Amino acid sequence: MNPPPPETSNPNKPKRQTNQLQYLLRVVLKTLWKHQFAWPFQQPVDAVKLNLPDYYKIIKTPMDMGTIKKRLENNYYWNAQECIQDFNTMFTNCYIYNKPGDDIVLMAEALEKLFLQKINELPT
Ligand SMILES: Cc1nnc2ccc(NCCc3c[nH]c4ccccc34)nn12
Ligand code: NA
Numbered sequence: 133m134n135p136p137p138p139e140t141s142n143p144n145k146p147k148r149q150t151n152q153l154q155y156l157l158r159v160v161l162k163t164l165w166k167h168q169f170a171w172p173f174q175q176p177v178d179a180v181k182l183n184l185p186d187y188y189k190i191i192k193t194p195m196d197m198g199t200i201k202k203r204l205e206n207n208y209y210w211n212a213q214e215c216i217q218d219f220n221t222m223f224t225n226c227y228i229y230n231k232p233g234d235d236i237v238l239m240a241e242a243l244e245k246l247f248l249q250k251i252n253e254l255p256t
């Protein structure tokens with residue numbers, strides 16, 4: 133059983149466009165997306181496809197870069213911090229579900245360092 137994927141729209145949630153959020157889509161997301169290690173994170177985990185019947189027994193706030201991309205494209209977020217929190221949830225979910233040294237964790241570790249490099253300095 134898969135749960136429904138995270139929402140990418142919510143009509144009662146207030147939306148905002150900011151310079152930092154535009155940068156998070158144009159630069160941060162689109163750069164990370166092309167990395168050799170981005171592919172496991174470009175869509176919600178499909179627990180039936182991937183044979184991870186315990187994934188959503190362990191991971192209660194799932195997140196992935198396909199969801200983040202759609203949220204940015206839909207102006208779903210109020211500010212850049214909210215979007216950064218989604219990236220952080222995505223990385224930490226990977227560390228939680230797996231264990232140190234796993235190939236997928238090495239991938240997340242590399243992407244997290246690139247992500248931090250890109251958000252170290254943001255537009256005003
Ligand atoms: C995302 C995510 N977070 N924890 C997990 C656990 C499994 C998973 N399957 C994706 C396909 C795959 C299986 N073994 C690998 C090792 C490294 C990179 C990707 C894979 N994705 N996954
Ligand atoms: Na774990």
Ligand code: NA
Pocket residue numbers: 249250251252253254
């Ligand atoms: Na930057």
